[PDB]
Short mmCIF file of all heavy atoms in Angstrom, two decimals:
data_model
loop_
_atom_site.label_atom_id
_atom_site.label_comp_id
_atom_site.label_asym_id
_atom_site.label_seq_id
_atom_site.Cartn_x
_atom_site.Cartn_y
_atom_site.Cartn_z
N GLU A 43 69.14 -0.25 -41.65
CA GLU A 43 67.90 -0.06 -40.93
C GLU A 43 68.02 -0.34 -39.42
O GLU A 43 67.80 -1.44 -38.92
CB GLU A 43 66.77 -0.85 -41.57
CG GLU A 43 66.57 -0.45 -43.06
CD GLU A 43 65.70 -1.43 -43.84
OE1 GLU A 43 66.13 -2.61 -43.99
OE2 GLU A 43 64.61 -1.02 -44.30
N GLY A 44 68.39 0.70 -38.69
CA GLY A 44 68.60 0.60 -37.26
C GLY A 44 67.35 0.32 -36.48
O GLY A 44 66.23 0.57 -36.92
N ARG A 45 67.57 -0.20 -35.27
CA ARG A 45 66.54 -0.62 -34.36
C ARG A 45 66.68 0.14 -33.03
O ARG A 45 67.77 0.56 -32.70
CB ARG A 45 66.71 -2.11 -34.14
CG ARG A 45 66.11 -2.92 -35.31
CD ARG A 45 66.79 -4.25 -35.61
NE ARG A 45 66.01 -4.98 -36.63
CZ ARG A 45 66.27 -6.20 -37.08
NH1 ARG A 45 67.31 -6.91 -36.63
NH2 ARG A 45 65.47 -6.73 -38.00
N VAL A 46 65.57 0.33 -32.33
CA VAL A 46 65.59 0.78 -30.94
C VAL A 46 65.43 -0.51 -30.15
O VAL A 46 64.47 -1.25 -30.33
CB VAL A 46 64.41 1.74 -30.56
CG1 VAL A 46 64.51 2.09 -29.07
CG2 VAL A 46 64.37 3.03 -31.39
N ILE A 47 66.38 -0.77 -29.27
CA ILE A 47 66.36 -1.98 -28.48
C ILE A 47 66.17 -1.65 -27.01
O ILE A 47 66.97 -0.95 -26.43
CB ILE A 47 67.59 -2.79 -28.73
CG1 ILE A 47 67.61 -3.21 -30.22
CG2 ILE A 47 67.57 -4.00 -27.85
CD1 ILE A 47 68.96 -3.50 -30.77
N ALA A 48 65.07 -2.11 -26.43
CA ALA A 48 64.67 -1.86 -25.06
C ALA A 48 63.86 -3.09 -24.63
O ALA A 48 63.14 -3.69 -25.43
CB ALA A 48 63.81 -0.58 -24.99
N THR A 49 63.99 -3.49 -23.38
CA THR A 49 63.17 -4.59 -22.92
C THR A 49 62.47 -4.18 -21.68
O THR A 49 62.83 -3.18 -21.06
CB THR A 49 63.98 -5.87 -22.66
OG1 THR A 49 65.03 -5.99 -23.63
CG2 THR A 49 63.07 -7.10 -22.79
N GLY A 50 61.44 -4.94 -21.32
CA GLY A 50 60.74 -4.70 -20.08
C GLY A 50 59.63 -3.69 -20.12
O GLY A 50 59.26 -3.16 -21.18
N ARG A 51 59.13 -3.38 -18.93
CA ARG A 51 57.88 -2.63 -18.71
C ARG A 51 57.87 -1.23 -19.34
O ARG A 51 56.83 -0.80 -19.89
CB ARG A 51 57.62 -2.48 -17.20
CG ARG A 51 58.51 -3.33 -16.30
CD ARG A 51 58.02 -4.77 -16.18
NE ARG A 51 58.63 -5.67 -17.16
CZ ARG A 51 59.77 -6.33 -16.98
NH1 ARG A 51 60.47 -6.19 -15.86
NH2 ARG A 51 60.22 -7.15 -17.94
N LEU A 52 59.03 -0.55 -19.25
CA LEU A 52 59.16 0.80 -19.76
C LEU A 52 59.62 0.86 -21.24
O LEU A 52 60.10 1.92 -21.67
CB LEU A 52 60.08 1.65 -18.87
CG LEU A 52 59.68 2.02 -17.42
CD1 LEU A 52 60.73 2.91 -16.77
CD2 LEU A 52 58.29 2.70 -17.33
N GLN A 53 59.50 -0.23 -22.00
CA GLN A 53 60.07 -0.24 -23.35
C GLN A 53 59.39 0.71 -24.32
O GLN A 53 60.01 1.17 -25.26
CB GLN A 53 60.13 -1.64 -23.95
CG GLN A 53 58.78 -2.31 -24.11
CD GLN A 53 58.96 -3.74 -24.51
OE1 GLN A 53 59.18 -4.03 -25.69
NE2 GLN A 53 58.93 -4.64 -23.54
N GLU A 54 58.10 0.96 -24.10
CA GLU A 54 57.34 1.85 -24.98
C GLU A 54 57.71 3.30 -24.73
O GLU A 54 57.86 4.11 -25.66
CB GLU A 54 55.84 1.64 -24.78
CG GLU A 54 55.35 0.20 -24.87
CD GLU A 54 53.85 0.05 -24.57
OE1 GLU A 54 53.35 0.64 -23.56
OE2 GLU A 54 53.17 -0.67 -25.35
N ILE A 55 57.88 3.63 -23.46
CA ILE A 55 58.36 4.94 -23.09
C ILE A 55 59.74 5.18 -23.74
O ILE A 55 60.02 6.26 -24.25
CB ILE A 55 58.39 5.07 -21.54
CG1 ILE A 55 56.96 5.29 -21.00
CG2 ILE A 55 59.26 6.19 -21.10
CD1 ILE A 55 56.15 6.33 -21.79
N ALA A 56 60.57 4.14 -23.75
CA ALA A 56 61.90 4.24 -24.34
C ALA A 56 61.84 4.44 -25.86
O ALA A 56 62.49 5.36 -26.41
CB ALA A 56 62.75 3.00 -23.98
N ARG A 57 61.04 3.60 -26.53
CA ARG A 57 60.88 3.73 -27.99
C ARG A 57 60.37 5.11 -28.41
O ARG A 57 60.89 5.71 -29.34
CB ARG A 57 60.00 2.60 -28.56
CG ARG A 57 60.62 1.23 -28.41
CD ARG A 57 59.86 0.13 -29.18
NE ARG A 57 60.43 -1.21 -28.97
CZ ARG A 57 60.14 -2.27 -29.73
NH1 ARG A 57 59.30 -2.15 -30.76
NH2 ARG A 57 60.69 -3.46 -29.47
N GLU A 58 59.39 5.65 -27.68
CA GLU A 58 58.85 6.97 -27.94
C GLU A 58 59.89 8.07 -27.73
O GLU A 58 60.07 9.00 -28.57
CB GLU A 58 57.54 7.12 -27.14
CG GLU A 58 57.20 8.44 -26.56
CD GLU A 58 55.95 8.34 -25.68
OE1 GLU A 58 56.04 7.77 -24.56
OE2 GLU A 58 54.89 8.81 -26.11
N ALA A 59 60.68 7.95 -26.66
CA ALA A 59 61.66 8.98 -26.40
C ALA A 59 62.74 8.95 -27.50
O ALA A 59 63.25 9.99 -27.94
CB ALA A 59 62.31 8.76 -25.04
N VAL A 60 63.11 7.73 -27.92
CA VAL A 60 64.17 7.69 -28.92
C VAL A 60 63.63 8.21 -30.28
O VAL A 60 64.37 8.90 -30.95
CB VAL A 60 64.76 6.30 -29.09
CG1 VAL A 60 65.78 6.25 -30.17
CG2 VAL A 60 65.46 5.89 -27.72
N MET A 61 62.40 7.89 -30.62
CA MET A 61 61.90 8.40 -31.91
C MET A 61 61.78 9.89 -31.87
O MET A 61 62.13 10.58 -32.85
CB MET A 61 60.60 7.73 -32.27
CG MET A 61 60.79 6.23 -32.49
SD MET A 61 62.29 5.56 -33.37
CE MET A 61 62.24 6.44 -34.91
N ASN A 62 61.33 10.45 -30.74
CA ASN A 62 61.22 11.93 -30.72
C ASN A 62 62.56 12.62 -30.77
O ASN A 62 62.76 13.65 -31.44
CB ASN A 62 60.47 12.40 -29.46
CG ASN A 62 59.02 12.05 -29.48
OD1 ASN A 62 58.51 11.35 -30.37
ND2 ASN A 62 58.35 12.48 -28.43
N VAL A 63 63.54 12.09 -30.02
CA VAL A 63 64.83 12.76 -30.08
C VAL A 63 65.45 12.52 -31.45
O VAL A 63 66.23 13.37 -31.90
CB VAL A 63 65.75 12.38 -28.93
CG1 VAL A 63 66.33 10.95 -29.12
CG2 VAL A 63 66.85 13.45 -28.73
N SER A 64 65.06 11.45 -32.15
CA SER A 64 65.64 11.22 -33.47
C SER A 64 65.24 12.35 -34.42
O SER A 64 66.03 12.79 -35.24
CB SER A 64 65.20 9.86 -33.99
OG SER A 64 65.82 8.79 -33.25
N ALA A 65 64.01 12.85 -34.26
CA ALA A 65 63.64 13.94 -35.13
C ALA A 65 64.59 15.13 -34.99
O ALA A 65 64.98 15.76 -35.97
CB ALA A 65 62.22 14.36 -34.80
N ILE A 66 64.89 15.46 -33.74
CA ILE A 66 65.73 16.61 -33.42
C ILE A 66 67.18 16.34 -33.84
O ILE A 66 67.86 17.26 -34.37
CB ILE A 66 65.66 16.90 -31.89
CG1 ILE A 66 64.25 17.37 -31.47
CG2 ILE A 66 66.63 18.02 -31.55
CD1 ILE A 66 63.90 16.99 -30.03
N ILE A 67 67.64 15.11 -33.66
CA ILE A 67 69.01 14.74 -34.03
C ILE A 67 69.13 14.87 -35.57
O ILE A 67 70.15 15.45 -36.05
CB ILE A 67 69.35 13.37 -33.50
CG1 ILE A 67 69.46 13.41 -31.98
CG2 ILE A 67 70.66 12.82 -34.18
CD1 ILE A 67 69.50 12.01 -31.37
N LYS A 68 68.13 14.40 -36.32
CA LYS A 68 68.20 14.51 -37.79
C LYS A 68 68.11 15.95 -38.27
O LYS A 68 68.90 16.40 -39.12
CB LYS A 68 67.10 13.68 -38.47
CG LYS A 68 67.28 12.18 -38.36
CD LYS A 68 66.18 11.37 -39.01
CE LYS A 68 64.89 11.58 -38.24
NZ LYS A 68 63.89 10.54 -38.61
N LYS A 69 67.16 16.71 -37.72
CA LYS A 69 66.90 18.06 -38.16
C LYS A 69 68.09 18.97 -37.90
O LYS A 69 68.48 19.77 -38.78
CB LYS A 69 65.66 18.64 -37.46
CG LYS A 69 65.02 19.88 -38.19
CD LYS A 69 63.52 20.05 -37.86
CE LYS A 69 62.71 21.10 -38.79
NZ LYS A 69 61.72 20.70 -39.98
N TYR A 70 68.70 18.87 -36.74
CA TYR A 70 69.65 19.92 -36.30
C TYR A 70 71.13 19.53 -36.38
O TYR A 70 72.02 20.38 -36.56
CB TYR A 70 69.28 20.42 -34.88
CG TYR A 70 67.97 21.15 -34.89
CD1 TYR A 70 66.82 20.57 -34.38
CD2 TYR A 70 67.90 22.45 -35.41
CE1 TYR A 70 65.60 21.25 -34.42
CE2 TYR A 70 66.68 23.15 -35.44
CZ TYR A 70 65.55 22.54 -34.93
OH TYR A 70 64.34 23.22 -34.97
N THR A 71 71.41 18.23 -36.26
CA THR A 71 72.82 17.80 -36.22
C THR A 71 73.17 16.96 -37.47
O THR A 71 74.34 16.69 -37.77
CB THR A 71 73.16 17.03 -34.90
OG1 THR A 71 72.59 15.72 -34.93
CG2 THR A 71 72.68 17.76 -33.65
N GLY A 72 72.14 16.51 -38.17
CA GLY A 72 72.32 15.71 -39.36
C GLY A 72 72.84 14.30 -39.17
O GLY A 72 73.16 13.64 -40.19
N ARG A 73 72.94 13.82 -37.92
CA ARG A 73 73.33 12.40 -37.65
C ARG A 73 72.32 11.38 -38.18
O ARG A 73 71.09 11.55 -38.02
CB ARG A 73 73.60 12.13 -36.16
CG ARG A 73 74.64 13.06 -35.52
CD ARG A 73 75.96 12.38 -35.30
NE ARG A 73 76.86 13.28 -34.59
CZ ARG A 73 78.16 13.06 -34.41
NH1 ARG A 73 78.75 11.97 -34.90
NH2 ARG A 73 78.89 13.95 -33.75
N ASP A 74 72.84 10.32 -38.81
CA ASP A 74 72.00 9.30 -39.44
C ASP A 74 71.51 8.24 -38.47
O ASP A 74 71.94 7.07 -38.50
CB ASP A 74 72.70 8.62 -40.63
CG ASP A 74 71.72 7.81 -41.45
OD1 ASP A 74 70.50 8.15 -41.44
OD2 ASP A 74 72.14 6.82 -42.08
N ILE A 75 70.58 8.63 -37.61
CA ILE A 75 70.18 7.77 -36.49
C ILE A 75 69.29 6.60 -36.94
O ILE A 75 69.23 5.57 -36.28
CB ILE A 75 69.57 8.62 -35.37
CG1 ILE A 75 69.43 7.80 -34.08
CG2 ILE A 75 68.25 9.17 -35.80
CD1 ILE A 75 69.28 8.69 -32.86
#
């Protein structure tokens, strides 16, 4: 069970970007993010 690790003011922007790109990484490349 992996984690997105980000600290500071922009951490929510970071978490959102990683979750969205995770969809694309899973759908198209099959990497287990």
Side-chain angles (χ1 to χ4, degrees):
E43 302 166 296
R45 280 149 173 184
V46 178
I47 297 156
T49 324
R51 349 278 93 88
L52 294 183
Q53 61 188 279
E54 309 176 313
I55 283 315
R57 295 189 183 194
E58 144 186 73
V60 177
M61 296 320 305
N62 290 5
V63 75
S64 290
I66 293 151
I67 291 167
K68 290 179 293 195
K69 199 155 192 103
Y70 293 106
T71 74
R73 306 255 184 190
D74 193 27
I75 193 161

